[PDB]
């Protein structure tokens, strides 16, 4: 209040430097402050959400501004395959001369933009820098609008009631209809009116869209259900994207498959797509009751789902209370669903590449995947971490009297025993099979390897029509039920995309699929072993069942009762961050070494040399860091010196993590005392005495900052290697 | 394209903004 932490006086009393670090790290924990009540919490997070969305749109207006002002965007639009897309320019006063000739792409020395943003803005139909300036101003306006709301809903006449936040009953009716249905339907209002004509040559700006309809006849004779007119003339084969030549004029054709030339999804397919998703989400918005009262009461929707079998507790009685009155359950489901959405998005940005001339720049497709995968694993780990925060600082087992959650805490020993079982099964049967293949290949014999065909994924590709296997089932068999059931609609345009091999849809498969996918399921079941462990033993363990009392991230219980290093529910986050980075590590290493074998062409280089570990470390890490690690020589440098300097940099970050993770506090707590003696005793400087007392970082913080350097070093090392590797083998 | 604006804005955000922000935040420990 009066000290540094202007919010909690329990830290302002501490004259050490703990008040700084805990004053920073508890700044957003609004549930545990001095006098921040229930209404005062929601009225703070409702404003800080506006501040956050203002930061998102300041970020996107930043990308619009640098691409608008320093990129080569419309020069890239002139030649999408040839020209490497520029990011923002450089102003280093540290580039002497020789680095300045290692960046010249035009007059600017800008970075090559490895983020796929020109492809998305080129499928949107921005063919200018001017439209990017009007967009950048158009999001400075929106960011200023959200900041003005964040000032507005913290002025006291406009800070809303808590019952308005407990109008959970109607947030879903407004979000699913408006935020999803109206924004998606309006997004067809951008695809149909901009992305359909500006890909068919017709530059339709803000000046002429209220005069030129996307169909030559429209909407006065078209409430009649003659909807085959809108999907009448598809762009069939002989089209180059952006131009008006070789293209039809239909709006909502569902072709299926790719472009033949740009290897992207059809924008007619997307217009029909978000139009359908728009209608279905608007139908979903009409779900629950409100002040009108035609829908579903949420208390009736959960309590009525109780089985007469009696096995599943006394039903969901209590769950509606412990989502409204709780928050980390709602945040846990939020990060859970967003995390599955991000992993799904990464599992479709490469698979069905939506954007024109992606799968042609081989680095941005490899940056988006690994991007949304590490964000995906972060968001799962957050969903479980607020799982444990829900079970500690938010869980009431009396409104949850023998409820489904109380049933979950009841049988949690079986859940942790079986995650430990399946994790122990996979880790002796990837490492069993990889050390078998590595020993056996090492002794001059690739043949005596255990290779198991992953038959189940090959069979599922046979259910989606990949005819390169010889199963001849539902879609790979042309005489089945489903193969005839959409014979005209979207199948024959799509099996061209399936049975092709260059495209990244339903990849060709050897036993590296088998062994790696067991390693990935190993990574998931281990990481959920940690998280479900420290999220169900978050409340109480038989080492110490007082764990509900000490809050979430208390340090330990001291050396008593055997020793108690990291008993808290913060070890679920703490250890599952290392397993998260390991698992998303193995995912994106596997994906990246798959597509470096497709794009180079030698898939036989993968399938013969990926089932043993020196196949990875030899054929992928040692070979594909060759353009990385040659990033600057004693002979000179090139454009990848930033990524090799970032590479060595991030090894230094990743190893400064180990100074905090391994070597814990009391070493430094009895060494900062030596430094404080050395400064208290020295002359000419004992005048300059500290105010906050020098104290080594407490071990809630120590394992955190070691974790943070572990992630920053890990992720910056791998973002250095993806981009330097694929930028070195190509471009 | 104003090719002179990063010569002003890059140093004044890169170095002198973490001078006055150190003053505002670090004296704002005591304010």
């Amino acid at each position: 209040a009066t000290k540094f932490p202007k919010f909690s006086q329990a830290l302002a009393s501490d004259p050490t430097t703990r008040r700084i670090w805990y004053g920073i790290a508890t700044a957003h924990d609004f549930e545990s402050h001095d006098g921040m009540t229930e209404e005062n919490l929601y009225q703070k997070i409702f404003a800080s959400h506006f501040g956050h969305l203002a930061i998102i749109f300041l970020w996107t207006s930043g990308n619009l501004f640098h691409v608008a002002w320093q990129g080569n965007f419309e020069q890239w639009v002139a030649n999408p395959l040839k020209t490497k897309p520029l990011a923002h320019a450089i102003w280093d006063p540290h580039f002497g001369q020789a680095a300045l000739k290692a960046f010249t792409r035009g007059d600017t020395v800008a970075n090559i933009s490895y983020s796929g943003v020109y492809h998305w803005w080129y499928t949107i139909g921005i063919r200018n820098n001017v439209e990017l300036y009007t967009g950048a101003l158009g999001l400075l306006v929106l960011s200023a609008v959200f900041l003005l709301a964040g000032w507005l809903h913290i002025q006291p006449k406009f800070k809303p009631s808590l019952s308005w936040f407990k109008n959970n009953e109607s947030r879903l009716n407004h979000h699913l209809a408006g935020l999803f249905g109206v924004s998606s339907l309006a997004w067809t209002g951008h695809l149909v009116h901009v992305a359909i004509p500006a890909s068919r040559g017709q530059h339709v700006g803000w000046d002429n869209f209220i005069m030129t309809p996307p169909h030559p006849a429209g909407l006065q004779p078209f409430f009649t259900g003659n909807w085959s007119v809108y999907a009448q003339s598809p762009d069939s084969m002989q089209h180059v994207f952006g131009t008006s030549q070789g293209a039809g004029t239909a709006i909502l054709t569902f072709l299926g498959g790719f472009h033949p030339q740009t290897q992207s999804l059809w924008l007619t397919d997307m217009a029909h797509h978000h139009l359908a998703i728009a209608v279905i989400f608007i139908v979903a918005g009409h779900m629950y009751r409100t002040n009108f009262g035609i829908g579903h009461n949420l208390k009736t929707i959960l309590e009525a789902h109780r089985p007469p079998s009696g096995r599943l507790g006394k039903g969901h009685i209590g769950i509606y209370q412990t989502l409204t009155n709780s928050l980390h359950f709602q945040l846990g489901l939020a990060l859970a669903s967003l995390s599955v959405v991000t992993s799904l998005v990464a599992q479709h940005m490469y698979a069905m590449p939506p954007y024109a001339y992606m799968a042609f720049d081989y680095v941005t497709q490899s940056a988006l995947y690994t991007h949304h995968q590490y964000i995906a694993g972060l968001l799962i780990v957050g969903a479980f971490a607020h799982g444990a925060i829900f079970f500690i600082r938010d869980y009431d087992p009396e409104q949850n009297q023998d409820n489904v959650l109380a049933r979950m805490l009841a049988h949690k020993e079986a859940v942790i025993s079986h995650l430990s079982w399946v994790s122990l099964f996979l880790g002796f049967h990837t490492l069993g099979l990889y050390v078998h293949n590595d020993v056996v290949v090492a002794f001059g014999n690739p043949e005596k390897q255990i290779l198991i065909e992953p038959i189940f994924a090959q069979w599922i590709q046979a259910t989606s029509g990949k005819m390169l296997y010889g199963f001849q089932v539902l879609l790979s068999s042309s005489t089945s039920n489903a193969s005839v059931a959409a014979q005209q609609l979207w199948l024959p345009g799509w099996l061209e995309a399936v049975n092709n091999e260059s495209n990244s849809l339903f990849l060709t498969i050897g036993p590296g699929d088998f062994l790696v996918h067991h390693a990935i399921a190993l990574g998931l079941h281990t990481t959920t072993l940690i998280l479900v462990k420290g999220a169900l033993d978050a409340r109480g363990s038989k080492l110490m069942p007082d764990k509900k009392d000490f809050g979430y991230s208390f340090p330990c219980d001291g050396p008593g009762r055997g020793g108690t290093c990291d008993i808290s529910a913060w070890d679920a986050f703490y250890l599952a961050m290392f397993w998260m980075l390991n698992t998303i590590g193995w995912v994106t290493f596997y994906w990246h070494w798959k597509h470096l074998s497709l794009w180079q062409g030698n898939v036989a280089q993968f399938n013969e040399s990926s089932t043993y570990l020196m196949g990875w470390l030899r054929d992928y890490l040692w070979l594909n860091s060759s353009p990385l690690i040659n990033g600057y020589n004693p002979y000179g440098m090139n454009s990848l010196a930033v990524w090799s300097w970032m590479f060595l940099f991030a090894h230094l970050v990743w190893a400064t993590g180990f100074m905090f993770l391994i070597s814990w506090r009391g070493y430094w707590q009895e060494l900062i005392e030596t430094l404080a003696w050395a400064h208290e005793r020295t002359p000419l400087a004992n005048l300059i005495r500290w105010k906050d007392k020098p104290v080594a970082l407490s071990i809630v913080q120590a394992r955190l900052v070691g974790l943070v350097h572990f992630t920053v070093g890990y992720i910056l090392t791998y973002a250095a290697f993806v981009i330097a590797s694929t930028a070195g083998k190509f471009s | 394209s104003a090719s002179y604006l990063p010569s002003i804005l890059v140093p004044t955000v890169g170095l002198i903004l973490p001078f006055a922000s150190m003053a505002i935040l670090f004296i704002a420990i005591e304010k």
Binding site: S61, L147, G150 | -
Partner: peptide
Amino acid sequence: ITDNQVFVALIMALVCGYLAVKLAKQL
């Protein structure tokens, strides 16, 4: 690609900066 539009942008994010610091010393 032009000059005065950049100045319009820095004015609008100067206003946005004043709304950010206007949000800052109230929460």
